[PDB]
Each structure stands twice: as C-alpha cells, then as structure tokens.
Amino acid sequence: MSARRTESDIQGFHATPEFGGNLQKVLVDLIELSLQGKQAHWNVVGSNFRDLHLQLDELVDFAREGSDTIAERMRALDAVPDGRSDTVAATTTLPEFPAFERSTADVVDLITTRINATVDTIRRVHDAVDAEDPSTADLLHGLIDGLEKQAWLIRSENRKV
Amino acid sequence: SARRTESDIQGFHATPEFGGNLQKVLVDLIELSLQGKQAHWNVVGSNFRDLHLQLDELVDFAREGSDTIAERMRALDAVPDGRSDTVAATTTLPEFPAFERSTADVVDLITTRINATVDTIRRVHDAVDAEDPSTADLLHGLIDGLEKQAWLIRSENRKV
Amino acid sequence: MSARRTESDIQGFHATPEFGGNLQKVLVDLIELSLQGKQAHWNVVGSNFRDLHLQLDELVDFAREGSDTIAERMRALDAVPDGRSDTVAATTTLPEFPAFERSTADVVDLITTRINATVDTIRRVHDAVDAEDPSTADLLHGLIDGLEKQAWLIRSENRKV
Amino acid sequence: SARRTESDIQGFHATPEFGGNLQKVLVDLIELSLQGKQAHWNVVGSNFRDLHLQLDELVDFAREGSDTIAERMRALDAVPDGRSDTVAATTTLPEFPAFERSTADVVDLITTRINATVDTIRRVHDAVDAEDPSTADLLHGLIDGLEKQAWLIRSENRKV
Amino acid sequence: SARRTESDIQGFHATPEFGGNLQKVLVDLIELSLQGKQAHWNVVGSNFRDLHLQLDELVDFAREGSDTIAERMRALDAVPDGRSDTVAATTTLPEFPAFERSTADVVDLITTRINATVDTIRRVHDAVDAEDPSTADLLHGLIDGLEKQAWLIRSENRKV
Amino acid sequence: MSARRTESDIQGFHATPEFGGNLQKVLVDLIELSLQGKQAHWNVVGSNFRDLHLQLDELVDFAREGSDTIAERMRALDAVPDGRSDTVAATTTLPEFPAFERSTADVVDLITTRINATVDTIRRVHDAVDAEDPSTADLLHGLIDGLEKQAWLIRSENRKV
Amino acid sequence: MSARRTESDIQGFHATPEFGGNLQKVLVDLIELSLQGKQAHWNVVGSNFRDLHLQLDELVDFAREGSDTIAERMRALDAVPDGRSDTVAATTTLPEFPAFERSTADVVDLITTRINATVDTIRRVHDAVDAEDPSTADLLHGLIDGLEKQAWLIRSENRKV
Amino acid sequence: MSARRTESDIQGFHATPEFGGNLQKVLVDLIELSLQGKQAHWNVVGSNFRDLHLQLDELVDFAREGSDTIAERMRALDAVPDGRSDTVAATTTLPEFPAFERSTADVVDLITTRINATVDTIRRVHDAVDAEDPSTADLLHGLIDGLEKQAWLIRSENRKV
Amino acid sequence: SARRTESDIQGFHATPEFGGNLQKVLVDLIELSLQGKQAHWNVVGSNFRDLHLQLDELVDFAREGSDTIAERMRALDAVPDGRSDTVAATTTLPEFPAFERSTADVVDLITTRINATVDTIRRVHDAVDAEDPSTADLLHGLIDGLEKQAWLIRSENRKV
Amino acid sequence: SARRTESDIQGFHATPEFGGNLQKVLVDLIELSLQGKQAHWNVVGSNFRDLHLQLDELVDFAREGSDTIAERMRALDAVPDGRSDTVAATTTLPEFPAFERSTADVVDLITTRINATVDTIRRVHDAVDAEDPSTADLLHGLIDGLEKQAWLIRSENRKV
Amino acid sequence: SARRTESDIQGFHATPEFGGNLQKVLVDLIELSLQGKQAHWNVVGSNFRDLHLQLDELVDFAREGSDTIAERMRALDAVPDGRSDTVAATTTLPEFPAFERSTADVVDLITTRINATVDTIRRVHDAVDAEDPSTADLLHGLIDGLEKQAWLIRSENRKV
Amino acid sequence: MSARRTESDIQGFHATPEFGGNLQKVLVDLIELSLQGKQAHWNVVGSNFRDLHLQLDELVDFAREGSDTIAERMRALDAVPDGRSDTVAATTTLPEFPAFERSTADVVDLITTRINATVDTIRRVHDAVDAEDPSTADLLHGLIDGLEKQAWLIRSENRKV
C-alpha cells in the first residue's frame, strides 16, 4: 500500500455554474440544428434533391451525437442539461427555419447559416470552457471540426466559379 | 398490349384533414423523442443503467417513427412541420420536468407520455385508415412498437 | 399557446379477457408448432433429408419469433400468456406429431398439416382480434404470411407435375 | 384434448380471381424493374449520379416486391407468370422510350411508371383485402415503398 | 497398404440405456427453455429489464443445448422425443407457476429450475462418460454453461 | 523535364455499331435467362424442390449481375443498351419457358437448355468482341465460366450413374 | 512475501514417441478424409446432387480444421507431423475412394464408411492419448463429435422409413 | 529536391525523465483500476447485479485500452513503461479494493472512488504533460472524458433524489 | 512418380521492355490518383456532393490499380518507381489545374485525364499480352474499371 | 408426472481445496497477462512486429482464461482474488524483467513463464478433475491454448 | 421470333486432352497445398510467425485454385482426380522433405514448389487457350496469384 | 424567437493566408510520405520482409487519411490545398527515397527518418496553428500521435539491446 490513498470518499470534478451554462448554450443550438436539419431533409425540393436529402441526414446524425456528447459531459461533471422543446425554442440562437417546401438552393444557404450559428456558439464559449476544463474543450474541437466540414460540404453546392 | 396511354399519371394526394392528422402524430413523436433524451440524461437512482439504456431504445424508435410519418406526408403531397416552436406549441404530451429525476419517477413519467403518444395515434387511426389503409399500417407499427416500450418501461414499477 | 394535456396519469390500452384468450390460442399453437418442427427436424430420414432438415429449422425459427411476438403483445396489452409445457399439451389444437423416425415424404405431409392447423387458428381468431385492435391483427397477418410461405416451401417436395 | 383429429387439414385456398389480381400486380412490378434498369443505364445529364443510384434502389424494391407477390401467389396455390412475352403483352405501364434520356425526362418518365404501378395495386386492393387481409398488408408495403420512390425521384424536377 | 479392405465399416453404436440417459437430459433442457420464456414474458418489478434480458440468454443456451443433445443422440442412432406431452410427462423440473411474478420470485424460481436441470446432467454423467467420453464433454459444456446462468441470476437476490 | 500530353480534350474508346449489336445480343439473352430463371424458381414442384428453388435464385443473381455488367460496358463504350420487355421478347434466342407448374426433373432439363443457349450466344459473338476489344472479351469469359458452372450445378440432378 | 519460482529455464510437456505416432495416425486419416471428401464433392451426380455437394464441403471444412488442430497439437508437444501426399497414401487406413463419377446413393454410402473409418482411428488411439495427456483427448472428443454429426447428416439420405 | 532536407538521420521527439515519470504514474493507476474493476466484476452481488457486472467490464475495457495507449505513447517518445504486478501494487495511488463478495451498493461507492482517484492522477500530471507535449495531453483528455463518463454511469445507481 | 528433380526452379523474368511498359502504366495511375484527390478536394458548384464522392471512388480504383501493377512488376523481377519526382517527370497526363474548379470543368478535366490513363494502358496492351497474357488480364481490369469511371463522370455533362 | 417436489434445490458447492486450486490457476493467468503486456510494450530488435503482435494474442488468451476461471469459481460458490498485491505475493511465475528487452530474450523469457503457467494448471488438474470433470475441461482449453502460444513464440529461437 | 426451336441445346464440350491438361494443373495445386501445410506446421527459426502465416495464405490460394480447376473440369464434363494416390503418383513437384526445417530453407523450398506449379500452368496454357479462352482466364488468375506468393515468400531470403 | 439571431447570412471561420500556408506544408509532407511508403512497401527485400511490407502499408493508410483530413480542413476553413505531383516534389521537406530494391534494415532507417521529417513539419507549425484555431491543432495532435507510433513500430526492428 506504499503509495495508496486512504480516503474513503474521493469526489469527482464538479463544473461551475458558468461552465454548466456554457455547455447548455451549445446543447440547445445542437438540438435546434438537428430539428432544423430534419425539417430541411423532409421539405427540400428541386435540382440535386437526393444529395441534399442525404447530406442533411448526415448533418442531423452528427448534431444528434454532438448533443448527446455535450449533455452526457454535463452529467459527468455534475451539471444538468435541458433539451426540452420549450427550452430549445426559447433559448436557441439559430434563426428560425422557414415553413413549407424549399428549393435546394434556398436550403443550402439556410442550413449553411444555421450550421455557422451553431459553430459560432461553440467558438464563443470555447475559451471559458478550455480555461476550466481542457478535456471538454477537446469535445468542442470535435464539434467545430465536424460541423465546419458539414458547412463546406453543403455550401459548395451553391458556389459559382 | 394492355399499356396505358397516359403521359402524366398523378400520385395519391392526401386531403388537408389527412395531412393534419399525420402532423398531429408527428409532433407527439418528436416531443416523445426529446422527452426521452431528457429522461435518458437526467435519470438517477436504483437500476439507473437499465433505464438509461431502455430510454435510448425508445428514442431510436420515436425518431425513426417521426421520419416514417414525415416522409409518408411528403409521399402523399403533405408538408410536415417538425420545428421546435411548432412541436412546443402543438404537442399534446404533458410537459416532462427539468432536473434530475429518480428511476421510479422516470418510469411513471415516460409511461404516461408514451401512452399520450399512443393515444394520438389511436385517435386519428380510423380517419387515416378510411382514406389510406397503407398509412394506417404504418400507424399499427407505431402503436405496436410504443406499446411494447410502455410495457418494458412500466414493468420496473409493478408491485408483485 | 399550448395543446399540452394535463393528466398526471394516462393509462394504456387494456385487452378484454376474450381478446387475451384469442391471443393465448394463437400462442399455444405456435409453441406446439415449434416443438413439433424440432421433433421432425431431428427425426426425418430418407430421400432429400438435408433440405427438409434445414427448412424445418427455418420454420422453427419463425414459429419461435412468432410465439415471442404474440406473448409480448399480450404483455403490452395487460394480458398474461401461458406457454408452459402442460398448458401447451392440454390446449393445443394441432394433431400430435408421431413418435420415432419418419420418412421425408411423411414429414412433408405431417408438418404441412400442422402448419395449416396453426394458420387456421390465426384465421379463426383474426376478425375478433381485428375488431378490438387492428395493430395486433397486423401481427397476425405477418404470422399468416410467414407460415403459409413455410407450408409452400415444405409441401412442394410432395407435389407431383 | 383440444387436439384436432383429422389427418390432413387443408390450408387456405385463394379463388382464381384473387390469383389474377395478384398476377396484375406482378406484371407491372416486373415491367417497372425492367424500365428502371433501362433508365438506370441510359440516363445522362445534370445530377446523373443521384438518378443512376436512385433508379437502382427503385429496381431493388420492385424486384423484391415481385418476388413477394409471386411467392404469396405460390403460398395460396396460385401460379405466377413473369415471362417476358406475358409481361410485355399484359403490363399496364406506358412503354419506356429507347435511347439516352436526360435526367429531367427520366424523372418525369419514371414517376409516371411508378404511379401506374401503384394505381394497379390500389385498383385491386379492396378485392384482395375482402378475400385475404394478410395479402392486403403486402400490398400496403408496396404502395408505401413505391410512393416513397415516386416522391424521392419527382422532387428533383419540383420548382418552388 | 495400410488401407482397410472392408466395404462398409459400421460407426460407433450407443446402447439404448445411453440413449435414454441423453433423453433425460433433453426433456429437462426443453422444459427449462419453456419455463425460461414463461418467466421472460411474465416477470415484473424492480430490475425488470436485466431479468427479462438474462432469461432470454438462458433460453438461448437451453435451446442450443437441447439441439446439441438431440443431434448427438441422432449421430449415435438414438431417437429423441421433444414433444410437448413427453416433456410435460417426463421432465423432473418443478412446474413454473402461472401469472405475473416479481423479479425476486423469478430469481429464486429459475435458479431452482437451472439447478434441477444441472442435477439431471450430473446424475447421468458417469454412465454417459463410461460409454462415450466425447458425449460427456458435451455434458461438461452444459454443466458449465448452466451453472454460470445460475450464478448470474441468483446473484440478484444475494444479500451481503 | 516532362512527358505530359497537351490536348485539352482526349476522347475515349468508341465501339463500332457491330460491336454494340453483339453486346446487345448478349444482353437480351441474359435478361431473358433472369426472367425464365425466376419463373422456374417460383413454379418448380416435386422431389428435391428446395435445392432447385435455391439454385435457380443463384442463377438469377448471376444473370442479373451479368446483364448490368454488359449494359454498363456498352455505356462505357458509347453504345446504347435496350433491355425493355418488348425488345427482350422479340429478340431473345432462348426457347420460351413453358407456362404453369413444372416438375423438378423438367425444370432441370429446361433451365440447362436455356443456360446452354445463353452461353452459345456469348461464345458466338466472342471472337468478334475479342478482336475489337480484349477487355470486354474478359467480361464475356466471366459470364461463360459463371453460367457453365450454373449449368453443371443444375443439370447434375438429372445425370444418372 | 513471494511464491515466485526461480528457474531461468522451464521446459514444456514433451510427448512420447508413441503419443506422437498416435496423433500422426489421426492426422493422415483426417487428411485422407479431406481429399476423398473433395473428390466426392466434385464427382457426385444424381438425385439430390446439390445437398450432397454442399454437405461434402462442410465435411471437408471440418476435416481440414481437424488436421490443422492435430498437427499443431503435435507441434505444441514437440512432435513432428507428416501430412505429405506419399505418406498419407502409404499410411491411411481409409478404403480408397473410387475413380470417376459416382451416384448420390453411392457417395452417401462410400463417404459414411470413410467417416466411420476416420472416427474408428480416433476411438482406437483415444485411451492411450487420454492416459498421457487429457487435454489432447478433449481435441479428439471434438473430432469424434463433429465427424459423427457429419456421418448422420450424410447417411440419413439413404436411410429408409 | 528544392525544399528537401539532406540529413541522413533525423531523430524523433524524446520525452524528458519528468514526462516519462508522469506517464508512468497514469499507467499504474489505469492498470490498478483494470484489476480492481475485474475484482468488482467477479465478486459483486445483490440488487441490480447484472447492470453492475456489465458496466464494470466496460470500465475494464476502457482502462485496459487506456493503459495500452499510455504505455505505447511512452514507447513512441523513447520512454519505458513498467506495468508489472509488483510495480503496480507498490506505486498505485488507488485505495485497495476489499476482498470477498461485496453488495452492489458498496461496489458503486468503492469503484466511483477508485475511478476518481485515477482521474485525479491524470488531472494532476496534465499541465506538466501539456507544457512538454500537447499531443499527449490530448490522449489524457480522452482518458479524463471516458473515465468521468464511467464514474457518472456507475455512481448514478446510488443517487437518491 | 512424375516428380521434377530440380532443386532451384526460377520464376518468369520480365524483359526490360516489359518492365518499362508496366512502369509507364504505373506513373499514369499514380498521377491519376493524385489528380483525382486534387479534384475531390477542390470541386465546387452544382452537384458538388455526387462529384466529390465519385472522384473518391476513382481514386480508390486508381490506387488499387497502381498497387496491382507495381506488385506484378515485383512478381516478375521488375522494379517499380512511384516516387513524386519520377511521377511528375514521366507521367503522360495533362496537368490538373490548381485552385477551386466548377463541377462542369472538373467533369471535363477528369474525363480527359482518365482517357489519357486508359490510352497508356491500351498503347502497351499488345506488347504486354505478347509476352505475358496473365498481366494483360490485369490490364483489362484496369481498362474496364477506368472506362466505367469515365462514363459515370462524363454523363454529368451530357446534353440530352 | 416425474416432476421434482423441491422448492429450493442448491447448486454444486466447491470444497475449499478446489477453490484454492482454481485461485492458484487464476493468479498465474493474471500474472502472465501482465507480463505479456510488459513484453508487448518493451520488446525491440529483429522481428519486433511479429513478437509485438503474438504477445498481444497471448495476453488476450490469458485474460479470457482468467475471466473463465474466476467466473467458474463464482458459479461453484468460491471467491476469486485477482488484486495486484495478491497476484504479486502468490504468483509462481518467475518475475519478468523491467526495461527494453531483445526479441531473442523476450522469446526465451515468455516461453518460460507460459510453461510455468501451464505447469500450475497441470499440477492442479487431477484434483480438479476428481471433484468436477466439467472444470477440468476448462483447464484443458487453457493447457491447449497456452501450449500453442509457447510453440508459436519459442519457434522463433529454434536453430535448424 | 428470334427464339430457337430445338428442345435440348447441348453445352460446350471440352476434348479429353483439354480435360487432361486441367488434370495436370489440379494435381500440382493439390500437391502444393499439402506441401504448404507441411511447411506451415514444421517451419522453425527466425521470422517463424510471418512464414507460418504466409504459408497458410498460400495454402488458402492453392485450395481455392484447385476447387476452381476441378469445378471448371466438371462444368465442361471432364472428371477430376484429386485422390492422394493419384496426386502422389502424378504431381511434377519435387517432394517436400520430412522433419523441422529452418525458415531460410522453407523460403527456398516453397519458392521452388510454387515455381514448379506455375510452370505446369504456363506449359498447358496455349493448348487450353486455343480450345477455351474462358478457361485460360482462370489460368491467368492462378499464374498471377501464385507468382505473387512466390515474390512475397522469396523476398525473405533476398540479400541486397 | 427570444434568443434567435435575425441575420440572413452568417459567415464561417476563414483561415488566414499564414494558416493556409502552414496546413499546405503539412499536406505535401503527408502526401510525399504516402508515396515513399508505397515505394518502400513494393521494393523492400530481405530478413523480416513480410512484417515490413505490411507495416509500411499501415503507415501509407494513416498518411493518406491524414492528407485527406488536412486538405478537407483547409476546404472547411476556405483555404485551397495543392496535392499535385509537381507541387509535392518541389515543396516537400522529406529527403528523397532512393531507387531500386532496398534491404529491410535500410528501409527501417530510411522510413523512420522520413516519418520524423513529417512529424517535425507538424511540430514546427503547431503553435501558429494552435494560436489561430485550437480545433485544427487537435487534428495535428492525431497526426503526431499516429505517426510517432508508426516510427516506434518501424524503428524497433533495427534496435540492438
């Protein structure tokens, strides 16, 4: 037992209220993005429908995994997520997705904007998150990388050169 | 030759009532999936792991269900609305509470909200079946699947 | 505003005693079919042994999945299944499978008859089941379809010209 | 004690009219698969790849469907006819045109072909359902699956 | 040059008593699988899900075991009897009770059922081993597998 | 320095009308074979039903993959395939498959003959195809090999001693 | 304190010459069985061709895995296997497989006899093997079980009533 | 060769003795955690046994992969790990796991403490590791994230709300 | 016994001309793969996703092709050179441009460079076949595969 | 009815000697796995890759072996101790050295320690078999598997 | 209308000399597989593991090849003979020596055995190709595959 | 819409010219490493050929995935990669790989040097990359970790102790 600790209880790392709040901000924007992504997935019409239909689902898959990652990281650090519809609608920074069928050109521009809004949230909280817990900032890096890749893959459709 | 002479054959077009009924099912499925994930993250206490895992299975089913319904709407020329504001404003599900909740409370809460979702589907079933039996088959899959989830979840709280 | 319901307790669909009894009838015949299917699978000998041996296992797989489906549907609807050996033996409507080894030709005829008997049970209770709960009748449709396919795949061995 | 004592129990038998109704579905599903492959090979133009791929998915579904229908016929002791001459002579689908076709033209052509196939299934549905609800469930799967393909393909040409 | 010159060489033949010993194992394994499914459906209460799942794993093992035993009998030209009437009439397992049962009760009930099945295999072991060591190896697999299931299930009720 | 070519446009290999016609001949017989293979698969009854039912599906799988291979090779070489039902029926060299149910023995003989007919088409056009484009002749070799294997696996049922 | 052994070199279990010879006997009969199994697989014709063709390959798979198991057990125990064609032919106890095509019925009888011969070798050496090394006898039990199952699956084709 | 280096030998990054020591500290605690996790996995009894039994194996899987990651990162950086039993026992910071059967409630509390002790070690060395080699600190972030997730999943069992 | 008495049997040795011909094929395949990845990253505009994906498929094929050829060289005692300087200095492919390129331009550019690669293989084919038919079979796989890629890519730009 | 009338049938209970023998096997398997990983990380020199890989295979086997034995103990109501202090204090294996070791030295060292582990299993075998043949079958799997590993590893150092 | 009217159309028939040529290939492929396993078991020394593994890959390829050849014979109504006595009596391969062999010796021995097998295939190639080009394609696959194995194995002994 | 942004266009993060240049440097060295890795894979001969042959392909797999990662990260951040042969040859920092067959000993030393040169490039740009975009620095950490592991696995072959 030469180096063994003898404390009966050893407590885990507990996130500050500010840290919890910062992850909550990321969470709602990821959930909103998933919901808007599905809306776009269903209602997109026009030239190159299939590629967009498929790409939007890939985006939704990533945003959903992202939200679960963030929420569970909150839980791990003794913080409590709120991903309920009312909370997401009331607190998301994303511009609202319009109703009805939308052209592929419109959807490309709309979804690129909404991805960028989500990335912006993660980028805004990054430094405060990194200062408290570098391991969580790494999860944010995964999100930034994965989402900015989605934005490039989607926006490239509308690019005229 | 028995070949049809037409050049533009139109597909089955849903009435506004029919589209509206599927929209009702859609918002409750989306809400159930959001509440399912909330419960999944925030459940604590005796038998946490089983509940945490079962809730994810419920969510998987409700998400595939929502996609099934929304795409059936698209196939029949209806337009789904699964946006957060619409879901919050029109869902019939009792609101899921915030914060940590015990496994016993989560069992009760989620069972109620599953049953609420099933109730929506059962409520619209006959009007859907009357117009389009093929869509009612999709509703049957939903009823069967969710009622299975309700049984698997609620059995945790059953006394002898 | 809000369309949210306010009940703290919402109960599920509860099957009538009659409905539960009808599903129980289906259950015992499916279990009996599985048991007879395995008996035949082990004890068939003669021309085209292997094909029959293999097809019988496929039949057993389907009947087993079927029995679990029906019993679990019963549970979902607050009914209580009984698949115990004594109950199955005392209440199955299937003619009993004979003892000892049986020829391929005999097994084809015997098993076809027992599938037909199992399907007849499902078809007999169908309308009463459909009347109370159309979703369960859909499960019955899968059983009818799957079992009648097995009957075709098995019986065709004995059909001439 | 509840055991039936008859030595040979006969299975459910379909009327010959029921068989003929399924035969109508079969030929149109085979025709659809043949036209789908023709389109898959010969489609050219903007968004080639998506159409090339989507057409193969339609063919996959139509082939599985035709197998499902033919084997249901066999299960009920009807006898399918999927031979080229019979398909050509009895299909209700408008003929697919020869040569390379633009993606825009293929979208419209195939949507019509799918809609024709669905129409056949919808036309026979009630007579099939009256005799055998289990078979009508198979028709529902086909209606749902094909109408999904119609939506996925036609959306390419939709201007909003 | 070392080649044997007899045209038909007979395989190993098991005595009828050996066959009867394997038959004893078979009926208890089938009974166990039937009781395991009964428990799997009807178990309710705290830690439902784990028990529901563990019971299916036990049934899987018991079903594979019964197939193994019956096919070993066939290999040695014995003739298994796995019919419902025979199983009910000849199984040594205490009957499983009807109706919903609490998880605590199911744990104790099934542990006993597994222990009864293992006892049968242990009782016939030495006579089987004396005649055919290869068959006794199969019995070892069953003893090891079932006693593992007994431990996995009973541990739920163990208070320390 | 550099071995780089300087053309802004380099065209691909273009098949002669004759070459295209030869591949079209192969195509229709492969499609006809697939259609007859499925007909036989559904309608075979009698001794050893299951083996034949299963082998016929394997034959159909190969003929379908073959038809796609040939049609796509045509497209690669700027030829235009025609696999429409009317064309297949009007131009196939295969004897027509008979109507209604057929015995296992009959199906073995019928399908073997139709495979033989399909292979004969490929062998007849082979040298002309090989002369123009050896790479396509290699695809023909796979078809010959794969189909003659099917013929062996099917016909052996009817071969005595 | 410590229960650690202090030897710089600990040798493994070394098989007696007799033990090695007994495993060699098993090896050659397994290899011969694999070779005869393939011969039968290629050259069987007649009623129920396909089932036999397929089952024979399963038998060959098992006998090949068996030969590798025995030879490798020999190596583990410092014995040296000989699976060369000349040795197999000169020392196998199996009756030789006949030349040319053979009927399904003939192949069933021939192969059953050759499996029986292979198993007899294993059963003959068993007790001497078990006496020296019970772990190897366990490998022999798997071979006995697996091969006798093959014999049942193959022979049942020819068993009447 | 315009930007090409012309040195014959280019050496890799070599960890300092302090860095090597820091990774060694993480290594022994990960190995100890794996050993204690298995002990708990085997000996846990009582309410919700199966969930705990299973979760403990998941923990062990992660801790084992973690130890291999750390050890191989040491090797990559020209450091030498020591994961031997005596070294692990003598130098681990983890409180000793008790002997005998332990209740599920006890095991939850015990294992949460031991996970937290492991995380604490990684957190203690993090900044010194990050200052020398940010790429290694990233591997530490994976460990912190994965282990704190395990602690949340395990401790939630005992949480009364 | 028909056994050969030799102790050192040598393998088939390729002439320098033959090795040189395979080397020609190798550099154009490597160049095509590098150009394919450049296009894959830098393509933008209408139908981006399909092109981005198709280009990766082309690259996969050209890379497996390069390995096939280089290892065939090794098998026949020839020595491949796939180094960047050698590829740049000896490839016959027109240079792929830098910077972002439109989907329409990428279709045209990549089709030309695929056709250039196929041309190399077709140019050496007869001399390769004359010496070693087995190697010409590998060339056929390459011709077939790349000409398929050319068709899939160029069809995007085809007008009616 | 042949049904047993008991309500509480107990399972096979291992003697303290039997539990002690399995405990002996357990600590040597755990020690072998720890030494295997040490060797895996620290081996250098000629044929590094093969040895690095083979050592991981040995470790996988010894870890699954340790779990097999510990859980067999649990099944028979014995209590394993796999803790670091217990393993260090009671293992019979010669200590594996620290620091980098050559492939030649690693071959020799690991072969010795495998043989030591096999020796433990062979030492307890007869007493285990006498009490419970089913457990001795598990021991046979271990002997077979580890002796295979010894052969695969030591063959590296064998001279002609 | 283009349909042939003969009731039985005969398949392609191979001359008996063609059959004998394939028989020559078959025996050497079987011999190679048997020698490959012998080497795989009995190889010892530096780089044991890589040789042990590579030899199994060669055996895999030789076994698949022999199946390919025998089944091609069957397809063309030739009759293969793969019996031990025939293989031993008619193979052209130098006998593999008995006992343990060093990795260096095995490399040289097996390279020769592969080269002998390839030589047989190359010797019969032109007569096979003249009668049936489709069969010669199979021979090409074997030549390419075996010569790859020769390169992979022999490279171990290559000093540069 | 309480927290929702109302901007129609939200632009993504755009890499500076310096950042783009830094990633370009990493890209060319990864591509050069892949090309040299394949050259070594093909032309390596001598003792332990197979292990080296195989390990070199694993290296190539990682370097290829790395180059795609870097290039696509450039695209995501509105930078433009150049992975063309001429550019790679003209701008890589890697010492040239020699022509012809090379011994396994030579290849180990050569490839270790070239891996280290690639790692050095990534390490040289790391801090400038990290200062502008921490999420990209994380991708660099993956590359450093994965490549230094390859160097250890390869170089260990030549290590004499």
Ligand SMILES: [Cl-]
């Ligand atoms: Cl679980």
Ligand SMILES: [Cl-]
């Ligand atoms: Cl089969």
Ligand SMILES: [Cl-]
């Ligand atoms: Cl796609």
Ligand SMILES: [Cl-]
């Ligand atoms: Cl390897």
Ligand SMILES: [Fe+2]
């Ligand atoms: Fe990371």
Ligand SMILES: [Fe+2]
């Ligand atoms: Fe209905």
Ligand SMILES: [Fe+2]
């Ligand atoms: Fe229905």
Ligand SMILES: [Fe+2]
């Ligand atoms: Fe259904």
Ligand SMILES: [Fe+2]
């Ligand atoms: Fe070919």
Ligand SMILES: [Fe+2]
């Ligand atoms: Fe065993």
Ligand SMILES: [Fe+2]
């Ligand atoms: Fe960082």
Ligand SMILES: [Fe+2]
């Ligand atoms: Fe040729």
Ligand SMILES: [Fe+2]
């Ligand atoms: Fe060829």
Ligand SMILES: [Fe+2]
């Ligand atoms: Fe024994």
Ligand SMILES: [Fe+2]
């Ligand atoms: Fe044993």
Ligand SMILES: [Fe+3]
């Ligand atoms: Fe989750």
